[PDB]
Amino acid sequence: DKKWLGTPIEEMRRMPRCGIRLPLLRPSANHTVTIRVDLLRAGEVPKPFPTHYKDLWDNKHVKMPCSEQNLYPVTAGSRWELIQTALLNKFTRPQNLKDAILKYNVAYSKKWDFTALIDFWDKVLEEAEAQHLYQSILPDMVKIALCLPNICTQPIPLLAAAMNHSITMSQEQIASLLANAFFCTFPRRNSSYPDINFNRLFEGRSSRKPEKLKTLFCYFRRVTAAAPTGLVTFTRQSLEDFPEWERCEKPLTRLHVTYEGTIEENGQGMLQVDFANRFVGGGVTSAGLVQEEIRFLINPELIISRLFTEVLDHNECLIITGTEQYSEYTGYAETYRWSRSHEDGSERDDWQRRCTEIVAIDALHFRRYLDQFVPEKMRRELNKAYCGFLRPGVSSENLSAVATGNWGCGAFGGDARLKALIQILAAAAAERDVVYFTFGDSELMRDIYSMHIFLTERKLTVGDVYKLLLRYYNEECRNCSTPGPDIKLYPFIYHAVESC
Ligand SMILES: Cn1c(=O)c2[nH]c(SCCN3CCOCC3)nc2n(C)c1=O
């Protein structure tokens, strides 16, 4: 019967109700703001700041395709002029789009296959859909792409490793950048940054990529029919000092656990976990189509983090506030399908950001299952999750619940019961409640609930629980000679505590 256990999801903190009154939006040394704050108003397209395009071409900023320093061999010609000449042509067949994109990517004319784009256009779309694509949608995408210098007038700093820095930009500015990415215009991007140009979406024989392209075109149709009016903030967070887990005397926090529902639909206004790759967005611009890549497709503004976010080190995360949902879907991986357009009904905060906060935290990939019970590996996951959850200088009553699930399970080989306890401990340390979605696994729901209430009723601290994890390693894992231990973790914990 029972679809959820624990604290009712209704009793969990959410944005905007729980939120602090935001300080005045303004640029600072650690906050790049690319719009006119004095003109930011509800329901109005933000005005770029500055008024005129300013260029930086260096190792600390995005290399813009419209830079006068973006050159091609002829003597040197302007590659931005070449990109205009190429893209300002009628498309009537997918070959025409391939040929356009290759005019300014000539070194890749042999290497970039467009099979998936061709299949999408010719073999997946209805003839009327394809018509609307080349008559309306692609020309509008070209125009927003070519408007980049008037839209993205302010250099965009890279969120490099170890930087604690935020970029607040307009949804409109993202749209212009993403249209550039579609047309593969970002220079020098073809090794510690994710791919941004969309060339791999077009290549190879694929059933996933046509569905990816349906999802992205749904977005591009929307933001070219009418400019979106809000802002999005991208924050890299890198922590210097981590808890002494074994000494942590904080209590556990509340838990809601359910096998029905999704982070994105049922965790509205909560801190939504992206089960991330350390290259944020994972295989979104290529073949990947599981939880991170789906989120990045239905909220495509997340993709632009790939333009400027260096690969995450162990102590870092990326926090994205304000992305809008444009699509709905069913399935995942081989069964993923674009369903329909989604009208996002989220309220906006006082910076006109959708009240949607997503954190990219990358779990480790465990080729050997027992490796993840090694203390250094448990601490690594605790500290990553803690970095993703913690908000320095916010009171606990202003913190939404964490909406998450089986982080690093699936391809990464994580143990769901261990990872649930790790996230429960990290959340407790960050003074946040947990909303946990087991994604149809009703046994796992009961198991996590049963363990959580056992530890709470016995008033064990974060430290008490961590020590029991160390016991489990030392007694059942360390000198274990088979692929799996003799005794499972939760049974071990119950016996260890009930024995006291
Ligand atoms: C809680 N949760 C998920 O676990 C999830 N997984 C997927 S894709 C398939 C892979 N997963 C299967 C469950 O283990 C995580 C790996 N999409 C998801 N969404 C939207 C979600 O809300």
Swiss-Prot record:
Interacts with PCNA. Interacts with NUDT5. Substrate binds at residues 263-264, 277, 291, 332, 406-411. It is an enzyme of class 3 (hydrolase). One of its GO terms (biological process) is nucleotide-sugar metabolic process. Its EC number is 3.2.1.143. It catalyses: [(1''->2')-ADP-alpha-D-ribose](n) + H2O = [(1''->2')-ADP-alpha-D-ribose](n-1) + ADP-D-ribose. The active site is at residues 274, 292-293. Keywords: Acetylation, Cytoplasm, DNA damage, Hydrolase, Mitochondrion, Nucleus, Phosphoprotein. Coiled coil: none annotated. Ubiquitously expressed. The PIP-box mediates interaction with PCNA and localization to replication foci. It comes from Homo sapiens (Human). Poly(ADP-ribose) glycohydrolase that degrades poly(ADP-ribose) by hydrolyzing the ribose-ribose bonds present in poly(ADP-ribose). PARG acts both as an endo- and exoglycosidase, releasing poly(ADP-ribose) of different length as well as ADP-ribose monomers. It is however unable to cleave the ester bond between the terminal ADP-ribose and ADP-ribosylated residues, leaving proteins that are mono-ADP-ribosylated. Poly(ADP-ribose) is synthesized after DNA damage is only present transiently and is rapidly degraded by PARG. GO terms for molecular function: poly(ADP-ribose) glycohydrolase activity. Residues 154-332 are annotated as: Catalytic. Belongs to the poly(ADP-ribose) glycohydrolase family. One of its GO terms (cellular component) is nuclear body. The keyword Acetylation applies. This is Poly(ADP-ribose) glycohydrolase. The keyword Mitochondrion applies. It comes from the Eukaryota. Signal peptide: none annotated.
